[PDB]
Every structure is written in C-alpha cells, then in structure tokens.
Amino acid sequence: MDWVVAPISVPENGKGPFPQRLNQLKSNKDRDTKIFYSITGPGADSPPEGVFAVEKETGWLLLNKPLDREEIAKYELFGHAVSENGASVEDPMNISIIVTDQNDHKPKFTQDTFRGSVLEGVLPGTSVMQVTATDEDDAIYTYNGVVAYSIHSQEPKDPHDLMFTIHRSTGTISVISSGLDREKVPEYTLTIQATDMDGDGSTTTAVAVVEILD
Amino acid sequence: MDWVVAPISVPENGKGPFPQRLNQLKSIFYSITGPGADSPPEGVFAVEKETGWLLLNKPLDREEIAKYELFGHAVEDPMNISIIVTDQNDHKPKFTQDTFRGSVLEGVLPGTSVMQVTATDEDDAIYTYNGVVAYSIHSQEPKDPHDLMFTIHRSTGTISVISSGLDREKVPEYTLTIQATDMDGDGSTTTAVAVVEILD
Ligand SMILES: [Ca+2]
Ligand SMILES: [Ca+2]
Ligand SMILES: [Ca+2]
Ligand SMILES: [Ca+2]
Ligand SMILES: [Ca+2]
Ligand SMILES: [Ca+2]
Ligand SMILES: [Ca+2]
Ligand SMILES: [Ca+2]
What we know:
- Chain B: This is Cadherin-3.
- Chain B: Interacts with CDCP1 and CTNNB1.
- Chain B: It is found in: Cell membrane.
- Chain B: Cadherins are calcium-dependent cell adhesion proteins. They preferentially interact with themselves in a homophilic manner in connecting cells; cadherins may thus contribute to the sorting of heterogeneous cell types.
- 2 copies of one chain form a homodimer.
- Chain A has strands at about 1-5, 10, 20-25, 35-40, 50-55, 60-65, 75-85, 95-100, 110, 115-120, 125-130, 135, 150-155, 165, 170-175, 185-195, 205-214.
- Chain A is an all-beta fold and about 210 residues long.
- Chain A has 2 domains: about 5-100, Sandwich (Immunoglobulin-like); about 105-214, Sandwich (Immunoglobulin-like), CATH 2.60.40.
- In chain A, the strands form 5 sheets. In chain A, strands 2-8-7-4 form a 4-stranded mixed β-sheet, with no helix packed on it.
- At the A-B interface, strand 1, strand 2 and strand 3 of A face strand 1, strand 2 and strand 3 of B.
- Strand 3 of chain A pairs antiparallel with strand 1 (about 1-5) of chain B.
- One calcium ion binds near residues 70, 104 and 137 of chain A.
C-alpha cells in the first residue's frame, strides 16, 4: 500500500539545521543493481538553484536553506533514478513541495485615520463606513493572514458610550444607537484595532472619525 | 520510483474547511486504526472507504498532540501512516517574573554577569523560531554616569555590565525595562523590569 501522491509540506523559516532531510526516494529496481538519484527543476538545477538537493546513493531529498512562502509558495521538482550504466527503468517522479505559512507579517491598516459620515436619524444597524487592514500572510489555509477587527474605545461618550460596533471580519463600522445629534456631538473618534491569526496574533491600531450629518 | 516512507506534515489550527483531505491511500475497501482514529482521541482522522482518501476531521493543536501514528488497511499488510503536526505561533512570550534582581560590587570589570532573566514561550523552539525568545533592553534609568551601561545576551538573557563607572554613593541602583520577543526577535514582545543593585 502506498500514497497516490505525497506532496511534502514544509513550513517556511525552519530552524533546520541545514541541510535538512525531507523524505527518501526509492527506485523500483531495488535489489538488482546500484542506483544513483538526482533531482531537477526550479529549486534544484534551475533558478533558484541548490535550494534542494538529493543524496546520490541514499537518496534522501534534502533542503539546503530555510524557505520563504511569500517568495515561492510551491516547488515542483523531478526525481531521477539511473543505474551505474546510465540506464533508467522508470519515469521521473513528480516531487511537490508545499511551503506552509508562518505568521511572519504583521497586520497593517491601509490608513492611520479612516473617515466616515452618517445621518443623525438613521436606523440602528446602519453601516457608517468600512476600515481595512492587510496582512501578507496566507489567509486561505491558515489564519495568519486573517484579521479580526475591534474597537478599543470611543470619544466623546455622548449621549453615551458604546454607540458604534465593528464587524469582526469585514471591518464595517455600524451605529447601534438612536440619539445622534450634531448640535450636542458633531463628531466621534474611535480607536480601532486589527489582530491577525483571527484575533490571537499581533495587533495594530488606527483611528476612525465619524462625522454626524444634517 | 516512490517514497520509502512519506509522513504528512499538517500545520496546527488549519482553516480547512473540515473534513479536509490529506493524501490518498492506494492498494476493495479502506479503513484506519490507531490513536486518532479508533482509539483515543477517537474520530480525529478518518478515511473514505472507497476512494482511500485520508481525512482530517478537525483542526489540530500541536501543543496537545504533536504527532500521530496510524495504520491504514485494505480488504497486503497494514501501512504505517505518520502525521506530524507542525507549529504555528499561537503563544506569546512571557517573563517568569515581573521583576528580576541581581547585584554587583562597584569594582567589577566590564563584561561582569549581573543576572540571568528568562521568558517562556509554549511554542516549538526545535523546528521553528516560534518558541525562540530574543532578549533586549528597552531602556535604563538613571543614565548616570551614562546610558547603555548594560547589555543582555540575545538568547541566554544574561545581563552584563559594560560600563567602568559604577559608584554606589552616586547611583545605588539601576532599573532596566527589558524585552523578550518570540520568532527570535521578529514576533511579539513582552516586557519586565530588572533592578541592578550596586553592592555596599
Ligand atoms: Ca516569509
Ligand atoms: Ca500575519
Ligand atoms: Ca508568512
Ligand atoms: Ca496550539
Ligand atoms: Ca501538552
Ligand atoms: Ca511564540
Ligand atoms: Ca504553537
Ligand atoms: Ca562600599
């Protein structure tokens, strides 16, 4: 019994040490004769060369240096088996390296101050504005690139505190109170925050200023 | 050509969605046994009995279980299935104390070890830098006879005095705000205080 295909999933920024053993190739001509293993492809013998190698006789696939997913997220190499008489009896084997994400990028708001406006009598639940923070990490297979939004605080507290909320995923800020009145309060300042790993990672801070309209 | 053995490396806290395909077994019907499948913790992994696709049924936690050894079956002797759970940086570093203390005589020479501070991080420090702490000094008070009178070693957390001008009568005590940062200096940072007594 065997795997139909076995990609190797390798976290970026490994400590190693290097060179680091990945998995071991085995030719089909096992007992018979002496086999020599080689590999080819982008990452081995074309750009970028020598990121991967193979032990000619064993043939342990080796990683020679830490990877960076945001540079190259996937490698596709080929493994070759050749006897000491130069003959092969098997096709190249597809070797697939999937570089898995680490949380090596901090979230960044696209602006340090966001601006919105809202009419003094709208229905509670009404969208006021939407803020955005980006993260270069992967947000498809990991949370490392996924930002969770929050509001740290709000000024002034008039009529009262907690007049707005922000959607945790979308960053749409909403008003959740009646009693907006420019006359008493023309503008609100909210500290907003975004935290990667969907709330568990690191945080960054910006300001949202909400103008009350007539 | 083929792999002699192929473990499956699966990062903890995956988004999935679940159940999530891993690799597909090939030899008629497939099953799996072992801790993770049929014994505790039960139901974490499973297989589609006709396709042979190994499935993970929920996100994993390296800090709970860092690996699994399962056995794949067809109805050939059984195949070892190894799952390696790889680390994500889901813990922040934390000094072991809020305040650390050490002392030196005023005549000690530059390079003298004052104290060793420590911060812990529950993440892996073997394969990744997620649990690897890099120490630094944030700031020193007072700055008499000068600033930057002390260093801290980036990995050991040993605080050393490098100034030649210690004088208890003028300044009997230095307060250092110190830092520990995971991912060996590129991650999150936590803070504590180190108080250096100049001994009478
Ligand atoms: Ca990277
Ligand atoms: Ca990130
Ligand atoms: Ca990354
Ligand atoms: Ca965990
Ligand atoms: Ca544990
Ligand atoms: Ca950590
Ligand atoms: Ca972890
Ligand atoms: Ca004295």
